[PDB]
């Protein structure tokens, strides 16, 4: 499940139909993420 | 989408903006950068165990969902913690 200070986070910006732009990947951003990235 | 009626049903769908006048993306970083630092960290480590935690389930709500993907992207930024050209690696 997802926290709920994500849900509030998602819909705080423009619809998910206003970002199809040039996008990432999901993928490669989580194992980004878990791994490669450390929040300051 | 019996991935998400399982796992994340409650996804919200994001504001309307008028981008007659309004940008999305200007919106997302205004959105995002004018909330207090401390914020953009916690949802970041936060959400960063619940990906470690649960990478496929993260990973494939990214997938679907974009708002989150650019919207932890601009939290990056935003901090410092990642640049637009850390991020096309990503694209």
């Given at each position: 499940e997802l926290p709920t200070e994500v849900l509030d986070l998602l819909s705080?910006?423009?619809?998910?139909?206003?970002?199809?732009?040039?996008l990432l990947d999901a993928q490669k951003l989580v194992n980004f993420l878990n791994d490669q990235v450390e929040i300051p | 989408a019996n991935f998400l009626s399982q796992?994340?049903?409650?996804?919200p769908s994001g504001i309307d903006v008028?981008?007659?006048?309004?940008t999305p993306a200007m919106m997302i970083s205004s959105e995002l950068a004018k909330k207090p630092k401390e914020v953009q960290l916690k949802f970041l480590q936060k959400f960063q165990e619940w990906t470690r935690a649960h990478p496929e389930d993260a990973a494939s709500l990214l997938e679907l969902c974009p708002q989150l993907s650019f919207v932890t992207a601009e939290l990056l930024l935003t901090n410092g913690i990642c640049k637009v050209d850390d991020l096309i690696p990503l694209a």
């Open positions: 705080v910006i423009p619809k998910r139909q206003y970002f199809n732009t040039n | 796992k994340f049903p409650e996804l008028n981008i007659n006048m309004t």
